[PDB]
Amino acid sequence: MRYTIMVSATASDAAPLQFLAPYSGCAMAEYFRDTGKHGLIIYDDLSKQSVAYRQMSLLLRRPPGREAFPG
Amino acid sequence: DLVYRTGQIVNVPIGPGTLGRVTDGLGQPIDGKGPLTNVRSSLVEVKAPGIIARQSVREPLFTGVKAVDALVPIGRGQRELIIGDRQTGKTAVAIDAIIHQKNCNEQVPKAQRVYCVYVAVGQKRSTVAQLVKLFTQTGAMRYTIMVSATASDAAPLQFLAPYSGCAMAEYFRDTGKHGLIIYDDLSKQSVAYRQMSLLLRRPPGREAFPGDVFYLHSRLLERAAKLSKELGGGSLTAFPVIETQAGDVSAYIATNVISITDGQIFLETELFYKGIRPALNVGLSVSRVGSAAQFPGMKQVAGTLKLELAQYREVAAFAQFGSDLDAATQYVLERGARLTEMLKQKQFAPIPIERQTVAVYAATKGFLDKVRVQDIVAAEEAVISQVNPAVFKILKANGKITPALDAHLKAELRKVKLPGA
Amino acid sequence: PAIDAGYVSQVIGPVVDVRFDGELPSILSSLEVEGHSVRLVLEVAQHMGDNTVRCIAMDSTDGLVRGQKVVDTGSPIKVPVGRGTLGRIMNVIGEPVDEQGPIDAADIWSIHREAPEFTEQSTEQEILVTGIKVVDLLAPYQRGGKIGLFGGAGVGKTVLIMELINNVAKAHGGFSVFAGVGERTREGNDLYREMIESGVIKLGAERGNSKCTLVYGQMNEPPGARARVALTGLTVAEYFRDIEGQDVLLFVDNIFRFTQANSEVSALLGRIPSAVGYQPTLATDLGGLQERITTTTKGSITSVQAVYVPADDLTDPAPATTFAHLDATTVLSRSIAELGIYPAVDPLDSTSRMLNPNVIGAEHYNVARGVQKVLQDYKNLQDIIAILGMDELSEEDKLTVARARKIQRFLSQPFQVAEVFTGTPGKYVDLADTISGFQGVLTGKYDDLPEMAFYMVGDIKEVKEKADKMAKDIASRKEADNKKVSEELKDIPSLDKLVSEIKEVVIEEDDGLEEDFKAEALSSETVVLNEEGKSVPLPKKN
Amino acid sequence: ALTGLTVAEYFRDIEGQDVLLFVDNIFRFTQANSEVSALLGRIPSAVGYQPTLATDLGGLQERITTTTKGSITSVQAVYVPADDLTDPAPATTFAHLDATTVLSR
Amino acid sequence: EHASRMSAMENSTKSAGEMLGKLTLDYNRKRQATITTELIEIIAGASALM
Numbered sequence A: 001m002r003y004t005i006m007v008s009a010t011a012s013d014a015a016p017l018q019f020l021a022p023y024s025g026c027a028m029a030e031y032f033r034d035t036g037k038h039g040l041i042i043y044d045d046l047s048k049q050s051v052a053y054r055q056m057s058l059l060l061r062r063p064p065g066r067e068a069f070p071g
Numbered sequence B: 001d002l003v004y005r006t007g008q009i010v011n012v013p014i015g016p017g018t019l020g021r022v023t024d025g026l027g028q029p030i031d032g033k034g035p036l037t038n039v040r041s042s043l044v045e046v047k048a049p050g051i052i053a054r055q056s057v058r059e060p061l062f063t064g065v066k067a068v069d070a071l072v073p074i075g076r077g078q079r080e081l082i083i084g085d086r087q088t089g090k091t092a093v094a095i096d097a098i099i100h101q102k103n104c105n106e107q108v109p110k111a112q113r114v115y116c117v118y119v120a121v122g123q124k125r126s127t128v129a130q131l132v133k134l135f136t137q138t139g140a141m142r143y144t145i146m147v148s149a150t151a152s153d154a155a156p157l158q159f160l161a162p163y164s165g166c167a168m169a170e171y172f173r174d175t176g177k178h179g180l181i182i183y184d185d186l187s188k189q190s191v192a193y194r195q196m197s198l199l200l201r202r203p204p205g206r207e208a209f210p211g212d213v214f215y216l217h218s219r220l221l222e223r224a225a226k227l228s229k230e231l232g233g234g235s236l237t238a239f240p241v242i243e244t245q246a247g248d249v250s251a252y253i254a255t256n257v258i259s260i261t262d263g264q265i266f267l268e269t270e271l272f273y274k275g276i277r278p279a280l281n282v283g284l285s286v287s288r289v290g291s292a293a294q295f296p297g298m299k300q301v302a303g304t305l306k307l308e309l310a311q312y313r314e315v316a317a318f319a320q321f322g323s324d325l326d327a328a329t330q331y332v333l334e335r336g337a338r339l340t341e342m343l344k345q346k347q348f349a350p351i352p353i354e355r356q357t358v359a360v361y362a363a364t365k366g367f368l369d370k371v372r373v374q375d376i377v378a379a380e381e382a383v384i385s386q387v388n389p390a391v392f393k394i395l396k397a398n399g400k401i402t403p404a405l406d407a408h409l410k411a412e413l414r415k416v417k418l419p420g421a
Numbered sequence C: 001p002a003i004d005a006g007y008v009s010q011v012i013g014p015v016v017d018v019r020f021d022g023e024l025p026s027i028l029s030s031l032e033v034e035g036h037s038v039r040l041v042l043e044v045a046q047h048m049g050d051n052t053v054r055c056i057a058m059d060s061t062d063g064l065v066r067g068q069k070v071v072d073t074g075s076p077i078k079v080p081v082g083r084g085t086l087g088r089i090m091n092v093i094g095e096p097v098d099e100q101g102p103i104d105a106a107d108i109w110s111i112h113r114e115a116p117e118f119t120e121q122s123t124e125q126e127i128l129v130t131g132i133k134v135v136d137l138l139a140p141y142q143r144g145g146k147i148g149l150f151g152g153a154g155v156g157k158t159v160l161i162m163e164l165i166n167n168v169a170k171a172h173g174g175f176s177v178f179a180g181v182g183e184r185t186r187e188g189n190d191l192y193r194e195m196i197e198s199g200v201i202k203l204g205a206e207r208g209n210s211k212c213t214l215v216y217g218q219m220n221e222p223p224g225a226r227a228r229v230a231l232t233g234l235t236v237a238e239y240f241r242d243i244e245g246q247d248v249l250l251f252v253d254n255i256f257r258f259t260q261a262n263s264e265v266s267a268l269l270g271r272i273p274s275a276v277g278y279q280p281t282l283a284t285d286l287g288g289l290q291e292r293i294t295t296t297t298k299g300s301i302t303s304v305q306a307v308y309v310p311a312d313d314l315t316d317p318a319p320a321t322t323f324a325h326l327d328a329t330t331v332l333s334r335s336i337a338e339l340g341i342y343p344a345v346d347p348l349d350s351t352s353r354m355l356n357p358n359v360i361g362a363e364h365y366n367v368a369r370g371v372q373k374v375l376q377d378y379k380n381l382q383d384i385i386a387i388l389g390m391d392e393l394s395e396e397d398k399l400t401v402a403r404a405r406k407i408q409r410f411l412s413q414p415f416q417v418a419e420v421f422t423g424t425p426g427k428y429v430d431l432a433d434t435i436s437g438f439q440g441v442l443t444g445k446y447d448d449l450p451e452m453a454f455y456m457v458g459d460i461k462e463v464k465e466k467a468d469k470m471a472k473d474i475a476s477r478k479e480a481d482n483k484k485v486s487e488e489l490k491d492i493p494s495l496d497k498l499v500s501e502i503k504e505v506v507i508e509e510d511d512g513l514e515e516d517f518k519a520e521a522l523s524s525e526t527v528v529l530n531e532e533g534k535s536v537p538l539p540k541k542n
Numbered sequence D: 001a002l003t004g005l006t007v008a009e010y011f012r013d014i015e016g017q018d019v020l021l022f023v024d025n026i027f028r029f030t031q032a033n034s035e036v037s038a039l040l041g042r043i044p045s046a047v048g049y050q051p052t053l054a055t056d057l058g059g060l061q062e063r064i065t066t067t068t069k070g071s072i073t074s075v076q077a078v079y080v081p082a083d084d085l086t087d088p089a090p091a092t093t094f095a096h097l098d099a100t101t102v103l104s105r
Numbered sequence E: 001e002h003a004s005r006m007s008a009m010e011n012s013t014k015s016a017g018e019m020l021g022k023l024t025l026d027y028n029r030k031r032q033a034t035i036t037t038e039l040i041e042i043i044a045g046a047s048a049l050m
């Protein structure tokens, strides 16, 4: 945990906090890339982030496509 | 055009003015015997009775066919689904129950009588007219009530008609009587709800049914139950019928209603088209309410039948075909080939509970093993005719076979006119 | 009082709209309608413009007119909760149905709270014995773990969760809260019988000593209740978690109907549907239900969920997002139950978090990974054995194939609540009974015992005695002969005097259904209403 | 198909003769309903058929019955779509056919 | 050797014949579930734009 950051969007939170959590997860790790170090990132359950994307659009009157995922 | 609200929630006429009449799914009878006279009109959309207004299932409900009363027991207030493919005996078993309920109504008192309700969904008007003609000539017309929404009528009539039949049988549930309702071909009632919901542009789910097709079959089937004795102690036994498609249980309607009813009655087409009619597949078909609430004594003698028909199907169909033969289990197979053809029956002739127990006695204890398998179905009808009619009068009376009776019964079963042998 | 007193704008089935004049209430707050035959409650969820909100009706909507006065509590839906509820049956609003008067409400908590955070979370893994050999070996239940029992409409997710209660809910120190969500109404009643006669529901003056609180939203209700009953019985857990501090037992039955009750109303809310027909919000709503079922650091919840897969198709999204919401997956399959092997737990997918060699130790991990090895050997060789027979492989794996049929029969186990419809009584098996019993079958310590000797047995004591019974029965084929002579004078009157010793029921004709009957006046033309509303016949124009 | 029924319904119900009838290619009549009822903006059913399948296919069948005045029998040529007897078009078709005569090469 | 195989390949033709029997029905019940799940994307694709 000394050398570990963890952004943790639960399933009991709203959709866009899960939608942004890999996006904010790489916002931390671009700093480790920008200042010469090496960075590890794990975007765990990235399909479930895409379901967190599918929730927002289908309430947002946006057209669906394959498996009702957006364009 | 001018619409007119009535001021009453959607209704259907209920009562003894409907006994012996074929009604539409709303209330206008089409038998030609004029409008209803001794009737009252209640709601067709009633909340199903709560838990504390209910009790357990205790009194058995017989059915009259050897295949069903032996291995898949049914109690009053228990809803047992019939399931199978087209032209495989689902409707035949259901009207054999209705004929069987007629004659048993001529041997029970008034407070234990039964009243039949046979709805009809999506069948041809040609064949359902042959059903009410057959119900007249068997005398079950006196205690049947018919709802026939055929394939011609519009989609909310085929959507409402099983609700109307349950409201017509709601009466006997309320005022202390006992009911038997047959939901016929409830898979076609699902497409009726599919029609009335898709044309309202409601977005459909798996296999294009709408989302609430479970709650439709729920509220239809949860209204048939067994009540406590505080509200007259009445009961209602349902028989939904679901048409499956070529050995599929994972159709969306078929797996829906099975998770509602108390058990299924599988009718496998493999057992049918070799001639075994009815084709009750005894190993897939359970009923987990009537096991305690069966006719006792039958449970003492068909428990051996259930354990052998547990093991008879296991060695079937490859005793000589598949791998090889061992001849150590020819004892179960050449006894089980008797017991499968023992469950056969010719059509439109129910066998009561007192005449099935001696029938299931005769093939179990070893009395009919010497007659070869090509003529046992004449042996069993001979056993009904050969043994003197005292024993049928005793076993229905006491309700349980005592040791003072079977020793008399074991002596009688040997001196029968065997076929062949 | 025309401020904050609205009327019904529009009714679409179980979904209604209330237009408000004074001020629209906050989301997930209740409404109370006036003038209905039932005390019907609404719950606001979307403020749909026009000073009008979006509701889902918790009861029957037949009879709503577009002018009826609708008042709010100014609060979310509160349920009477507390120790006095132990032995009561509540529906979604918590009015009693068990006819024992009202409920002595210790407190009235709202059904809509925030889920507990990371700071309140506990990582203390321990084991839960059940009396099942398939559970306590292949995926042992955590003492503070969420439990899933995926069943395919008739494979025994009602019996196994009723067998589990009849084993551990009596011996566990804390209460139970049973939340029947969309189960058949009769099977709630047999749970009401079984808990009285086993001393878990005590009526009269002894209510506070009982060990079970019932919550029932069975499938008779329109889908407001089934959308919210699994939340209400969870709030019976919240008062027993944060306040009481005890270890509650939450056996939520058929939690799929929660996901389907939202699926009934979200087709009416104008929402563009998701994949195969569910709402878009099943990701958060199943999250908003599952993640209150968490063991806090001030008390746990030892809960079992039951997720009904729709059509024996586990790639459906309603169990697919439910795998991750569960510690111990226990999948019940359909095809295995066709052989009669009860319970038909899929051994090769039922995975727990407790299956880990550093918590239960490598004595148990080596046992389960051997069983899951040879079944995966066996399931790899199902394709050859069906089309070419067994007689083609070497003797290095045809030993393992018969070894598979041994351990497939041994997973069968009778259940102590299934004794009503099976005859045999169930067996209560300890943890050390199984792992000792399962070690030797892996090595082949009982290979000379036949494959039917493992069927429906409890312990490793019962594996040889039934194998002795099968052998003993063969010599009972020609052991002795029975004959019963000199009995016809002992206790039997006759056969003909058997006829005269029966009391005859006097069957009465003229059943006469006119008793307790009303038979109102029903004429030819239907009654209509004119413009003033008087019951006149329909005027003769078509 | 309704025209062939009503020139049969004149001979069934006035002359009193037992008329024959051939509603040829009943898969095509089902599919002719599948294109006319998808054209009117109705929401599609299962596999691509109309949602008014059972009601409007039955509306042809339910006027071919017998009566006291006469009887009309139909010989509906059926093409099984994609050689599947669980397709929804023969599924409701074989809920009215009383005799099923196969013709083999 | 050639005789028992002549009856072992007979039953193997039946057994690998009945596994073709269920599997075409496993082809059909997935195909009609495929087109319908492919169809309702279009209705969900069309109703949002009307």
Ligand SMILES: Nc1ncnc2c1ncn2[C@@H]1O[C@H](COP(=O)(O)OP(=O)(O)OP(=O)(O)O)[C@@H](O)[C@H]1O
Residues within 6 Å of the ligand: B085, B086, B087, B088, B089, B090, B091, B092, B093, B123, B185, B277, B278, B345, B346, B347, B348, D095
């Ligand atoms: N015990 C029996 N003896 C002889 N024939 C039988 C028996 N039981 C069923 N059959 C035959 O099987 C058919 C059963 O008809 P039934 O209406 O039950 O089939 P179905 O699957 O319900 O068809 P549908 O759903 O179209 O009514 C009858 O035509 C009858 O000829």
Ligand SMILES: Nc1ncnc2c1ncn2[C@@H]1O[C@H](COP(=O)(O)OP(=O)(O)O)[C@@H](O)[C@H]1O
Residues within 6 Å of the ligand: B259, B263, B286, B287, B288, C151, C152, C153, C154, C155, C156, C157, C158, C159, C160, C342, C343, C413, C414, C415, C418, C422
């Ligand atoms: N331990 C068992 N022994 C024998 N049969 C069982 C056992 N457990 C389940 N079953 C069978 O599985 C069926 C499951 O029915 P039920 O549990 O009510 O439906 P679901 O599985 O959808 O909850 C029962 O009919 C019963 O016959």
Ligand SMILES: [Mg+2]
Residues within 6 Å of the ligand: B090, B091, B185
């Ligand atoms: Mg039928």
Ligand SMILES: [Mg+2]
Residues within 6 Å of the ligand: B259, C151, C153, C154, C157, C158, C308
């Ligand atoms: Mg279930």
